[PDB]
């Protein structure tokens, strides 16, 4: 996902907030 969260949330569809990145079903995309 590549994005950050700001708080635990993220733009990216599907990107859950991870180690300040957003991951899709863990893949830091």
Do not use: A, H, W
Request: hydrophobic share 10%; charged share 15%.
């Amino acid at each position: 996902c590549g994005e950050t969260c700001v708080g635990g949330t993220c733009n990216t569809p599907g990107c859950t907030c991870s180690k300040n990145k957003c991951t899709r079903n863990g893949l830091p995309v």
